[PDB]
Design a protein around this ligand. Structure first.
Ligand SMILES: *[C@@H]1O[C@H](CO)[C@@H](O[C@@H]2O[C@H](CO)[C@@H](O)[C@H](O)[C@H]2NC(C)=O)[C@H](O)[C@H]1NC(C)=O
Ligand SMILES: *[C@@H]1O[C@H](CO)[C@@H](O[C@@H]2O[C@H](CO)[C@@H](O)[C@H](O)[C@H]2NC(C)=O)[C@H](O)[C@H]1NC(C)=O
Ligand SMILES: *[C@@H]1O[C@H](CO)[C@@H](O[C@@H]2O[C@H](CO)[C@@H](O)[C@H](O)[C@H]2NC(C)=O)[C@H](O)[C@H]1NC(C)=O
Ligand SMILES: *[C@@H]1O[C@H](CO)[C@@H](O[C@@H]2O[C@H](CO)[C@@H](O)[C@H](O)[C@H]2NC(C)=O)[C@H](O)[C@H]1NC(C)=O
Ligand SMILES: *[C@@H]1O[C@H](CO)[C@@H](O[C@@H]2O[C@H](CO)[C@@H](O)[C@H](O)[C@H]2NC(C)=O)[C@H](O)[C@H]1NC(C)=O
Ligand SMILES: *[C@@H]1O[C@H](CO)[C@@H](O[C@@H]2O[C@H](CO)[C@@H](O)[C@H](O)[C@H]2NC(C)=O)[C@H](O)[C@H]1NC(C)=O
Ligand SMILES: *[C@@H]1O[C@H](CO)[C@@H](O[C@@H]2O[C@H](CO)[C@@H](O)[C@H](O)[C@H]2NC(C)=O)[C@H](O)[C@H]1NC(C)=O
Ligand SMILES: *[C@@H]1O[C@H](CO)[C@@H](O[C@@H]2O[C@H](CO)[C@@H](O)[C@H](O)[C@H]2NC(C)=O)[C@H](O)[C@H]1NC(C)=O
Ligand SMILES: *[C@@H]1O[C@H](CO)[C@@H](O[C@@H]2O[C@H](CO)[C@@H](O)[C@H](O)[C@H]2NC(C)=O)[C@H](O)[C@H]1NC(C)=O
Ligand code: NAG
Ligand code: NAG
Lengths: 162, 420, 50, 198
């Protein structure tokens, strides 16, 4: 097997040789020479995602490694993973490119910020105050809805054999 | 043999009616899932793992796991869009006034609690407490909106629907005192405002008692949140089944790639590996299709939840039973893990009473019809009263309208009509 | 660009590949074998059979 | 980027067909992916097995495409049912459902056709230029409480009027736009004012 051998707090019985998890995979082992219990963890693994602002605008990119601590590889640490190539900003804006756990990045260089929920607006409420409109505004909005997709038919014999 | 329900027979007769003389403010809950866990699968790790020659054998098979990655990314972005549509419906974060006095109504249970470090109302905290690793390329992506932002949207919607009625959902937010908003809501369902203004204390007490009973009932029944628990259960058990399928023989001599490679020469090792990888690809295809179907169902549920949020909350809905049993008044949303919980406040009549009714009153050869109510009679006199409440009033010429002579309608009765 | 099979990449986030840490050592663990066969008696015998 | 949905439909179908077509050039683990080559290079005894593997792979791929098409068709049918509902309600009438036919109060809508879809033009009414006022629930007058029939009592500071909820149209409080119900002892917040009688 392959992994990271670490000290195990698990206590095998004297006849116990292997340890297994719920997934029925090896996780704890007993050393034949010196009778000690060791853990096995798979080597740090994760997917790679590329944040790009569009090739038309520019070419700079910031890469996010999913589910890895930043110490196991302009570096930022998020809940989604380790984010490199982008700088974290205390400011807040709307979400431009989603990342995860409330973090969104955009191009201004590349900046990563916590997404903004909306404009704060406290309304003055009191038990003897009402507000009545004095004017109006006719608004026109659009709404696009797909209806039918393209009808296709296959010829099995010619596709399979020909 | 199951019994459909208790026998009942309303004493229908030719000229009798029943009119409520009392009401009962009722609060009901409705639980709706919104999104499930966003998962992404890895092709090479799941199919065999760390064998480079295995990857060489796989890459010539086709671009199947490319399609699988595409489909799972589509599902993930669909989940995020579902949450956005359900919750992100207001572009401002409304904030409740510091002094929380709304004419006797007590919103402590649903308003955010600053004492808690999580900034959540007791109801949603109970919901969170009432709902309950090792991966081989099986990644779980985090949702874009954390729980705190969802609670923030819920608080904003609550503040908007308490301070400014339903006006904030159709333009700028216009403040209005809460008792007048409630009187407006009764006037929406055909009951005049005086009924509220003469019963404000009783209505407030009933509302508080109902909301307390709802909190207690959620605290007691553990099976109420099944519609949310089963989503997590389904996802977890499907993932566990997929993991278990990894160590399946699939007709090969052995279930271990390394053992097959070591103990067998390439001639038949190739055939064994082909069988194994085909079986694993088939299992992964089945899992992906199951995930797609579940995503479609959850998206339908999320669209229904968005419609409920838009109609029952942001306004008042006259659709029957769409926002709770009884006449709808207003509803309060509450956040929940992978879903949303509504608190429908509804008006329910009670304590009906028999009366003798007539279609019209003949007087001076003229037939007087009720303008907004219904003619009743306690036995001797005749009054006109609103349909949903017993509010007897002396019949006059301003709450009735004349139409034709009194020899054409059927069942007309003789009486006088006072003129002010 | 290779993943999308296109020369221009639209604004957004894309998944390309996986990050894997490659192992670089081998650890074989077997007991302290101490079952020496009696080859000393067979070979180092002063007198052999006919 | 306004027409994202229809473009997504077209692109999804095009890329699905493209993937299905490109699936032909896959060996599926067979030594070749051409019928004639396997027919000419090998005799039936193992060419049969090779052809079996190839045809099984191709059928599996095509069936996967069919299932994907079925799921997408179900989604499109749901969207089309929603579109039919929107037409029948917002276009052929007026809707009281909030945000169903556009943000704000709905007035009327106009449809427009589009490739593989339909586009609506929701004409909606939006209030603006709000102004605060001091209001009372009811008016006590000679021991009788007067409630508005449809408006709400407002006061600029010295005089009281009744006006409709959605627009500021002040009116003199008379006995025809108010209805009497009981005395002014039980209503909480009632104020004092005269009620003109024509
Ligand atoms: C209500 O709003 C409309 C526009 O929203 C106002 O009409 C504008 O009035 C100004 C001042 O006379 C003109 O310069 C503009 O050209 C008008 N706009 C249009 C489109 O004609 C209207 O005056 C407002 N009414 C009140 C009472 O405030
Ligand atoms: C008052 O209404 C009740 C029902 O709301 C009537 O009770 C039923 O009346 C019918 C006809 O008189 C009887 O056949 C039923 O047996 C009655 N129900 C029961 C449970 O006994 C009642 O009669 C009405 N009374 C008046 C004076 O109208
Ligand atoms: C209308 O119903 C309410 C609630 O059912 C009644 O209020 C109750 O009245 C009784 C008798 O005075 C009290 O013992 C209860 O404590 C009251 N309940 C509450 C919640 O306050 C009310 O009396 C009914 N009115 C009529 C005319 O029947
Ligand atoms: C609104 O509801 C809250 C919660 O039920 C009430 O707070 C309770 O107050 C009583 C008496 O002061 C205490 O015995 C309870 O322990 C309180 N509840 C909790 C959860 O601590 C509150 O009094 C109600 N009314 C107002 C105006 O807030
Ligand atoms: C029906 O209601 C009317 C009006 O409430 C009653 O008429 C009055 O009833 C009160 C209470 O009994 C008496 O003090 C008045 O003298 C009655 N007025 C007249 C003109 O008679 C009537 O009694 C009620 N009928 C029944 C059967 O209850
Ligand atoms: C209501 O009153 C009218 C007039 O007072 C009644 O009409 C009379 O009915 C009697 C009985 O048949 C006739 O002889 C008269 O010729 C009718 N006069 C007119 C002008 O129509 C009527 O019958 C009464 N109905 C009820 C139900 O009391
Ligand atoms: C009507 O009056 C109220 C208070 O008299 C206004 O509420 C305040 O408005 C100012 C305007 O910028 C804000 O700075 C304050 O913060 C508001 N008060 C509170 C407690 O938040 C209200 O804005 C007025 N209405 C209009 C349309 O201007
Ligand atoms: C509130 O509105 C009333 C109605 O217009 C105002 O009363 C009039 O005010 C104008 C201008 O001040 C005078 O010319 C009229 O003579 C007033 N009419 C009456 C019957 O008094 C009143 O002034 C307004 N209040 C405020 C504070 O502006
Ligand atoms: C509205 O008018 C009534 C009667 O004109 C006022 O009632 C009087 O209130 C004073 C002050 O408490 C008492 O001394 C009188 O005995 C009351 N008379 C009557 C007939 O009720 C009432 O106060 C007025 N409203 C306000 C807010 O002042
Ligand atoms: C109105 O609210 C104020 C504080 O906002 C409170 O002191 C007062 O008692 C309330 N009065 C009524 C009639 O609600
Ligand atoms: C009213 O209905 C009863 C049955 O409940 C019937 O016997 C009677 O004839 C009806 N009266 C008229 C005027 O039709």
């Amino acid at each position: 097997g392959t992994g990271v051998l670490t000290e195990s707090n698990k206590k095998f019985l004297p006849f116990q040789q292997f340890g297994r998890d719920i997934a029925d995979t090896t996780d704890a082992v007993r050393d034949p020479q010196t009778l000690e219990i060791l853990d096995i963890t798979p080597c740090s693994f994760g997917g790679v995602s590329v944040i790009t602002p569009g090739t038309n605008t520019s070419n700079q990119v910031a890469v996010l490694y999913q589910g890895v601590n930043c110490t196991e590889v302009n570096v930022f640490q998020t809940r989604a993973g380790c984010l490199i190539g982008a700088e974290y900003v205390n400011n807040s804006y709307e979400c431009d490119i989603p990342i995860g756990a409330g973090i969104c990045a955009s191009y201004q260089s590349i900046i990563a910020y916590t997404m903004s929920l909306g404009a704060e607006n406290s309304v003055a409420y009191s038990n003897n105050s009402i507000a009545i409109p004095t004017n109006f505004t006719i608004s026109v909005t659009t709404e696009i809805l797909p209806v039918s997709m393209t009808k296709t038919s296959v010829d099995c014999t010619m596709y399979i054999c020909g | 043999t199951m019994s459909l329900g208790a026998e009942n027979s309303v004493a229908y007769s030719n000229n009798s009616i029943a009119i409520p003389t009392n009401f009962t403010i009722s609060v009901t809950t409705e639980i709706l899932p919104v999104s499930m866990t966003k998962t992404s699968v890895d092709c090479t790790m799941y199919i065999c793992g760390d064998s480079t020659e295995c990857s060489n054998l796989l890459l010539q098979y086709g671009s199947f796991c490319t399609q699988l990655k595409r489909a799972l990314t589509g599902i993930a972005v669909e989940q995020d869009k579902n949450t956005q549509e359900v919750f992100a419906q207001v572009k401002q974060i409304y904030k409740t006034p510091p002094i929380k006095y709304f004419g006797g109504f007590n919103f402590s249970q649903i308003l955010p609690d600053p004492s808690k470090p999580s900034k959540r109302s007791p109801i949603e905290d109970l919901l969170f407490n009432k709902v309950t690793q090792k991966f081989k390329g099986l990644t779980v992506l985090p949702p874009l909106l954390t729980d705190e932002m969802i609670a923030q949207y819920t608080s904003a919607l609550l503040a908007g629907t308490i301070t400014s009625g339903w006006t904030f959902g159709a333009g700028p937010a216009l403040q209005i005192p809460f008792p007048m908003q409630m009187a407006y809501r009764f006037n929406g369902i055909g009951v005049t405002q005086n009924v509220l203004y003469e019963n404000q204390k009783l209505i407030a007490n009933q509302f508080n008692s109902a909301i307390g009973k709802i909190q207690d009932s959620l605290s007691s029944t553990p099976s109420a949140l099944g519609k949310l628990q089963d989503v997590v259960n389904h996802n977890a058990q499907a993932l566990n089944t997929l993991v278990k399928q990894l160590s399946s023989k699939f007709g090969a001599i052995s279930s271990v790639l390394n053992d097959i490679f070591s103990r067998l020469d390439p001639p038949e090792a190739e055939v064994q590996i082909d069988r194994l990888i085909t079986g694993r690809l088939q299992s992964l295809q089945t899992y992906v299709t199951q995930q797609l179907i579940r995503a479609a169902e959850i998206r339908a549920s999320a669209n229904l939840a968005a419609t409920k949020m838009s109609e029952c909350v942001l306004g008042q809905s006259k659709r029957v039973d769409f926002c709770g049993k009884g006449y709808h008044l207003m509803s309060f949303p509450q956040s929940a893990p992978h879903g949303v919980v509504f608190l429908h406040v509804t008006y329910v009549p009670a304590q009906e009473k028999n009366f003798t009714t007539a279609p019209a009153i003949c007087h001076d050869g003229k037939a007087h019809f009720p303008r907004e109510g219904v003619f009743v009679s306690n036995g001797t006199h005749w009054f006109v009263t609103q349909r949903n409440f017993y509010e007897p009033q002396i019949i006059t010429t301003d709450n009735t309208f004349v139409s034709g002579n009194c020899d054409v309608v059927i069942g007309i009765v003789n009486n006088t009509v006072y003129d002010p | 660009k290779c993943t999308l099979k296109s020369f221009t990449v639209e604004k957004g986030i894309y998944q390309t590949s996986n990050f894997r840490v490659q192992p670089t050592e081998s650890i074989v663990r077997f007991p302290n074998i101490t079952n020496l066969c009696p080859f000393d008696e067979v070979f180092n015998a002063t007198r052999f059979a006919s």
